[PDB]
From a paper:
The coronavirus 3C-like protease (3CLpro), also known as main protease (Mpro), plays a crucial role in processing two polyproteins (pp1a and pp1ab) encoded by the virus RNA genome. Inhibiting the catalytic activity of 3CLpro has been proven to be an effective strategy to block coronavirus replication. In this study, we have identified mutations in SARS-CoV-2 3CLpro that confer resistance to WU-04. To understand how these mutations affect the WU-04 sensitivity and the catalytic activity of 3CLpro, we solved the crystal structures of these mutants and aligned them with the crystal structure of the WT 3CLpro.
The M165V mutation directly interferes with WU-04 binding. In the crystal structure of the SARS-CoV-2 3CLpro/WU-04 complex, residues M49 and M165 pack against the bromophenyl ring of WU-04, suggesting that these mutations directly hinder the binding of WU-04 to 3CLpro. We purified the WT 3CLpro and the WU-04-resistant mutants and measured their inhibition by WU-04 using a fluorescence-based enzyme assay. Both the M49K and M165V mutations increased the IC50 of WU-04 against 3CLpro by more than 20-fold. Conformational changes in the three regions are also observed in the crystal structure of the M49K/M165V double mutant, but not in the crystal structure of the M165V mutant or that of the S301P mutant. These structures demonstrate that the M49K mutation disturbs the local structure around the substrate-binding pocket of 3CLpro, but the M165V mutation does not induce conformational changes. In contrast, the crystal structure of the M165V mutant is almost identical to that of the WT 3CLpro. M165, located within a β-strand deep within the WU-04-binding pocket, when mutated to the branched-chain amino acid valine, may cause a clash with the bromophenyl ring of WU-04, directly impeding WU-04 binding. The S301P mutant showed a significantly decreased dimerization ability (Kd = 17.81 ± 7.32 nM) compared to the WT 3CLpro (Kd = 0.94 ± 0.21 nM). In contrast, mutations M49K and M165V did not inhibit 3CLpro dimerization. Particularly, the M165V mutant demonstrated greater resistance to WU-04 than the M49K and M49K/S301P mutants in the cell assay, whereas its resistance level was lower than that of the M49K and M49K/S301P mutants in the enzyme assay. The M165V mutant also showed greater resistance to ensitrelvir, while the M49K and M49K/S301P mutants showed negligible resistance to ensitrelvir.
Residue numbers in the entry:
A (entry chain A), B (entry chain A): 1 to 306
The structure:
Amino acid sequence: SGFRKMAFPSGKVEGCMVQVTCGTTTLNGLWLDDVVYCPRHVICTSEDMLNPNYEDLLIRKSNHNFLVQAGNVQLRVIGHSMQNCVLKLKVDTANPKTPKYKFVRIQPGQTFSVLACYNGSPSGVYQCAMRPNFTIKGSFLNGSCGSVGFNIDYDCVSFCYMHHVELPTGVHAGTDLEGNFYGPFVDRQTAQAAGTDTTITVNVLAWLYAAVINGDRWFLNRFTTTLNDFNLVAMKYNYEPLTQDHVDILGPLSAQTGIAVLDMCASLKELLQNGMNGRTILGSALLEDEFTPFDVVRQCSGVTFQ
Amino acid sequence: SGFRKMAFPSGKVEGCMVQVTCGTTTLNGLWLDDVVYCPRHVICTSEDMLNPNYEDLLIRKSNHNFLVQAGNVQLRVIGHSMQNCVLKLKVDTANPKTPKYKFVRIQPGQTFSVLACYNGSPSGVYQCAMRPNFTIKGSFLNGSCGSVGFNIDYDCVSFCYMHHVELPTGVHAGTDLEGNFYGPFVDRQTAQAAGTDTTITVNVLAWLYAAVINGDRWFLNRFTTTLNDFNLVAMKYNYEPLTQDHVDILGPLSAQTGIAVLDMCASLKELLQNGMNGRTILGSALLEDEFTPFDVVRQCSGVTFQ
């Protein structure tokens, strides 16, 4: 029993974390096969980040201006390219620690494990979620740029995030492994507005299912509600609208607990209108939205990986 | 910026997770050098766990009754011994993935990363703390026994915990890597009472320092208090007594933030007497006590590891 915010084992990802230095800027890179992926702002100075012409700044650079270090081993760069906002450095050595991997662009609300790195050295690992406004609430200091988020199916590491920018509001933004930013953000030191952030409603419901499984059942009423009546409560409290697709993915949790999805929505509706009255759910006084329905099923059944 | 419950990179520990099978019981083992460490209740059936004579049950077993599997490789057992509550299986092959390691018995209040495993396969990683009553609030299903907790200095993995028993209350208990249980618990399926659990006061204060560093400063008053006056508030709300040693380890945090330790204690005293009034601190509506002063310094400075 017990429920914890759990991150995937980071071993398969640590073996791909290298250090990329271009001039004075040093950040982290993802070494897969014979290609190193890193944020393209490694080619920028501090003044450049105000308004950088990345095409021009990349032209001034050659292959030998990029220093890639895998621990203590230097990697000779034999080619460089810019795909959107990431830099693709072709090296002469294929990474022997390369795991099975894909490049996946996740959707808002999905979760992934983040391996925070500095100077190509792994520092820590934590689980976070892609907010509906395409930001993430992570822990990123200077030098963490190039840290990657990922999911592990079993033997396959689905890389889905690379950190690029910390917004002036303290939240973070980045791209997928093809350089395409999540959301309207850009890799430039300017005032960037993140939209209104809502709560991932389907994640809150799955977390409530995890609580019933683990003994916390005080929030269970026998009130029920319709999908439209609940979404009327969801819009008032800045919750994402619940669709039939969300009900379908909560199916197995509803079958294991024997609690209908709409019955749990009425419990959440009462939680939103009345609060928690000082009580706790799974050791939390707030409504958690960083557990997808898939995350709850994994932890409540013991799904392992390589 | 940003503050997250961060776990150490688990790569160095994944390479030591093997599967130990004795009869019908299968659990996880820690393969270091040419010795595999696992809970001694691998030799017990389900009926045995009610009241097991471990010396007798071990005598019925021989070296060939223990099946150790490192992924797909079988490890021939050439010797077995019982040290307290752990089983030491000597194998013919030294683990090539053995990192630099020590065996350390942590104190209550300290934190460590837990690598939850099943059938010798790593499943997830999360950070937890040794409660003052020597329990831990983890996520452990059937088969997770043998999962280890650890800390990483830089290249050295300080193994400090092995999971053995889930108490009937849902909390978990285990031993160090020498088989000595943390607390008064035993590896037997019986009614085991865990003492009253208190809040790690020094951890709450360091977490409040992390909040001031990250912008959350609404709880800052200019009230002050004495060490004895605060401990009078601590005893009422089931908090651990604060000592001068606790003030000394919070020194660097007090120097970085410029906030005296006793000034922060008065802020916590107001938080205990008045609550949080619906506000949040670092995204939490409760007072977090699973961040040691060392954990805050690491995350607020970027300490990396191998």
